[PDB]
Write a protein that binds this ligand. Structure first.
Ligand SMILES: C[C@@H](O)[C@H](N)C(=O)N[C@H]1[C@@H](O)[C@H](n2cnc3c(N)ncnc32)O[C@@H]1CO
Ligand SMILES: C[C@@H](O)[C@H](N)C(=O)N[C@H]1[C@@H](O)[C@H](n2cnc3c(N)ncnc32)O[C@@H]1CO
Ligand SMILES: [Mg+2]
Ligand SMILES: [Mg+2]
Lengths: 136, 136
């Protein structure tokens, strides 16, 4: 699993055209104030241990930033060892579930399988932009 | 070299605190309208062939999108095989130079060695978000 943690002042996205023949999640949009935006690329190795490692780290980092909202934002482009789409979708649902057992704030999982528009205003402070990798 | 190509409706950045002891580029800010924003992570293997491959591809993609502005945006977080900072800086300057010989539009190289704030509104069309890798 490859993640990018962006500490945003604001974030918004809108699904556009479907990127898969059958996106598993309905189309939509949302916007937010201060939030940790987590661009998430599910990799072939990812299983339950990986999800739990990622959930814990996300929770921990959010704690250090005093953020109260985490956006789980599916992203195909952070690595070149992607999981297949149905496995990736399952992992992301598991990650949302796991994160709720470790982080007390709002957890929003963006829809999976779509081309997206978005806007982010990303903070400039030293921890506002970090990358993570998790495996088992 | 690992790149992320974002077709933006708008982009702006501002350097914040220095991320290196001696950033090689002065602090600053800039904003743009429609532009291909190229998040660029220089890797250890990168040399002159890599720069020329990347310059050509960037030019080619920009051509297909009918963009007339390319932003070369230094980014430490797209891979886990980074070049050292002075090598990365040299490569990015070379890449800016190479790109100007292949792409007729505005080429802006963001300052190197800084924590950054930014905002981007990224387009939702199918080619608005792509990743690339170049080597020799
Ligand atoms: C494209 C860009 O604007 C948008 N944000 C996008 O990336 N959409 C992705 C994810 O929602 C999802 N997806 C497919 N495979 C994966 C994977 N392995 N990991 C995470 N997401 C995946 O399927 C879409 C197409 O690759
Ligand atoms: C941090 C985030 O907000 C900001 N955008 C940032 O990434 N700043 C980076 C790049 O400007 C640069 N840098 C250092 N090494 C590299 C490298 N190998 N490749 C590209 N840039 C590098 O040095 C800074 C600190 O890593
Ligand atoms: Mg809509
Ligand atoms: Mg300034």
């Amino acid at each position: 699993m490859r993640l990018l943690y962006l500490h945003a002042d604001r974030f918004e996205y809108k699904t556009v055209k479907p990127a898969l023949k059958n996106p598993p999640d309905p189309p939509g949009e949302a916007s937010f104030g201060e939030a940790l935006v987590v661009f998430t690329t599910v990799e072939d190795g990812d299983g339950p241990q990986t999800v739990m490692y990622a959930a814990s780290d996300i929770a921990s980092h959010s704690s250090r930033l005093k953020v109260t909202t985490v956006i789980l934002y599916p992203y195909a482009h952070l690595s070149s060892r992607l999981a297949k789409p149905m496995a990736a979708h399952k992992r992301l649902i598991e990650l949302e579930g796991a994160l709720r057992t470790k982080f007390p704030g709002h957890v929003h999982r963006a829809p999976f399988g779509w081309y997206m528009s978005f806007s982010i205003a990303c903070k400039g402070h030293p921890l506002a932009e970090l990358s993570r990798s998790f495996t088992e």
